[PDB]
A paper describes a structure:
The heterotrimeric Replication protein A (RPA) is the ubiquitous eukaryotic single-stranded DNA (ssDNA) binding protein and participates in nearly all aspects of DNA metabolism, especially DNA damage response. The N-terminal OB domain of the [name] subunit ([name]) is a major protein-protein interaction element for RPA and binds to more than 20 partner proteins. The [name] domain adopts an OB fold with a five-stranded anti-parallel beta-barrel but has very weak ssDNA affinity. Its primary role is to mediate protein–protein interaction with its basic and hydrophobic groove and a side pocket, as first shown by a series of studies of [name] interacting with p53.
[name] also binds to the N-terminus of [name] and is responsible for recruiting the ATR–[name] complex to DNA damage sites to initiate the cell-cycle checkpoint. The complex is recruited to DNA damage sites by RPA coated ssDNA through [name]. We crystallized the [name]–[name] fusion protein in the P212121 space group with one molecule in the asymmetric unit. [name] peptide binds to the [name] it fused to and the linker region is disordered. In the structure, [name] residues 53–69 form a three-turn helix with two short flanking loops. The hydrophobic side of the [name] helix, consisting of F55, L60, L63 and L66, packs against the broad hydrophobic patch of the [name] groove. [name] R43 and R91 form salt-bridges and hydrogen bonds with [name] D54 and main-chain carbonyl groups at the N-terminus of the [name] peptide. At the C-terminus of the peptide, [name] R41 forms a hydrogen bond with the carbonyl group of [name] L63 while [name] E62 forms a hydrogen bond with the main-chain amide group of [name] K88. Mutation of F55 to alanine greatly reduced the affinity of [name] towards [name], indicating that the hydrophobic interactions mediated by F55 are critical for maintaining [name]–[name] association. F55A/L60A/L63A triple mutation almost abolished binding between the [name] peptide and [name]. Mutation of the conserved arginine residues in [name] (R41, R43, R91) significantly reduced the binding of [name] to [name].
Author numbering:
A (entry chain A): 0 to 34, 39 to 120
B (entry chain B): 53 to 65
The structure:
């Protein structure tokens, strides 16, 4: 199945269990610039979506040159979770690989629901 | 979803 390609449950593992050494495969649902530009990502593991992913600045060329885009599938290789002053937690993506382009995937996979943030 | 004005200041670092 297409959702079988994703690391179902990885978002819960990051948020609830504090798993930091997993290398989950996730789908980009949306990329939003925020304000040197920074990018917030809505990401999916096939079961849940999380709105609080942020791209490390060193990864901005992946967005700028349009290889990281809505519907692409990527594997996260390094990330850090940080807590903001108001209690919101942000997952900062430091290293990732784009495994399949948006054009090669072509759709949002499955029907993930928002994780409780 | 989007970050509040306060969050935006902290994320810059």
């Amino acid at each position: 199945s297409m959702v079988g390609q994703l690391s179902e449950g990885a978002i819960a593992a990051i948020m609830q269990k504090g798993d930091t050494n997993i290398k989950p495969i996730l789908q980009v649902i949306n990329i939003r610039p925020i304000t040197p530009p920074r990018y917030r990502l809505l990401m999916s593991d096939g079961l849940n979506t999380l709105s609080s992913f942020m791209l490390a600045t060193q990864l901005n060329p992946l967005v700028e040159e349009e290889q990281l885009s809505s519907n692409c599938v990527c594997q996260i290789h390094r990330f850090i979770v940080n807590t903001l002053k108001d209690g919101r937690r942000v997952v900062i993506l430091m290293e990732l690989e784009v495994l399949k382009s948006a054009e090669a995937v072509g759709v949002k996979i499955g029907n993930p629901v928002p994780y409780n943030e | 979803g989007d970050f509040t004005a306060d969050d935006l200041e902290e994320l810059d670092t």
